[PDB]
């Protein structure tokens, strides 16, 4: 991707995280576990449904359209009718295919951007009381219990208290 997070420095997905698109996996003395991030997933869902609804709305319903008849001395008008029908069909086929092809790439870049933003948000919080390992992973220097974990996954991690 353009942002280098999905299939980048984080090289795989989690099949054990079932309730969201992006999230955390933690590990301390109490135990382990996954947990989704709700704000990022909610924003992404809003954006994606908006995009799908706009795509649906820009194409209007097609009403009754049946062919005509001509005799042996009206070949020019028959050819003009065929020309018009074929041209409009070709134009709309091109439009639909191009729209889908171009929207798919932007949709795939959106999720990469969201994952990168989440990683940076956590990294600026921990700054000094944690070591960056490389796979999207942080190893604490002090002892981080469940209150510490839940404060990290909230944005209100208190840097001075843990030096």
């Amino acid at each position: 991707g353009l942002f280098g997070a999905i299939a980048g420095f984080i090289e795989g997905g989690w099949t054990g995280m079932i309730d969201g698109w992006y999230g955390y996996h933690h590990q301390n003395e109490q135990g382990s576990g996954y947990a989704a991030d709700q704000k990022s997933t909610q924003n992404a869902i809003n954006g994606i449904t908006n995009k799908v609804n706009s795509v649906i709305e820009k194409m209007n319903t097609q009403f009754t359209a049946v062919g005509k008849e001509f005799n042996n001395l009206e070949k020019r008008m028959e050819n003009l009718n065929k020309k018009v029908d074929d041209g409009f069909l070709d134009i709309w086929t091109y439009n639909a295919e191009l729209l889908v092809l171009l929207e798919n790439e932007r949709t795939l870049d959106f999720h990469d951007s969201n994952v990168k933003n989440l990683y940076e948000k956590v990294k600026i919080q921990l700054k000094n009381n944690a070591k960056e390992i490389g796979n999207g992973c942080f190893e604490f220097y002090h002892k981080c219990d469940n209150e510490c974990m839940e404060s990290v996954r909230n944005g209100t991690y208190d840097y001075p208290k843990y030096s």
Partner: nanobody
Framework: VQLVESGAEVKKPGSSVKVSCKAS????????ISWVRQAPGQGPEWMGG????????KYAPKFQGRVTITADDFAGTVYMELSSLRSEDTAMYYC??????????????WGKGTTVTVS
């Protein structure tokens, strides 16, 4: 948004029933949808709900083997099917919004109601 259920139905025991729910706005939604039951003279009862994109469905432990909830997405409709009707599945059925994409305890928009009688 506005939620509109289907019409009122009367059946006899041993059969099944299928109610529907239609929401205004764009066909695709970013909130979960739940179904609530209320018998005459008692408090409401949560039956089950559905999630917008992941497609997960949740049911109450009482209504485990009978209820089936489905969606249409492109139409904007949600369907609920209840099987093996007893004489106790005679109540008012409501369709409820949820706010977010998860089936939490906060339903902020309700429909109007639909009576299903069994006899």
């Amino acid at each position: 948004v506005q939620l509109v259920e289907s019409g009122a139905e009367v059946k006899k025991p041993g059969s099944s029933v299928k109610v529907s729910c239609k929401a205004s706005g764009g066909p695709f939604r970013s909130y979960a949808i739940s179904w609530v039951r209320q018998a005459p003279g008692q408090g409401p009862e949560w039956m089950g709900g559905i999630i917008p994109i992941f497609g997960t469905t949740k049911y109450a432990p009482k209504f485990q083997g009978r209820v089936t909830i489905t969606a249409d997405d492109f139409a904007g409709t949600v369907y609920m099917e209840l099987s093996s009707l007893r004489s106790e599945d005679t109540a008012m059925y409501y369709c409820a919004k949820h706010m977010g994409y998860q089936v939490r305890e906060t339903m902020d928009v309700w429909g109007k109601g639909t009576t299903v009688t069994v006899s």
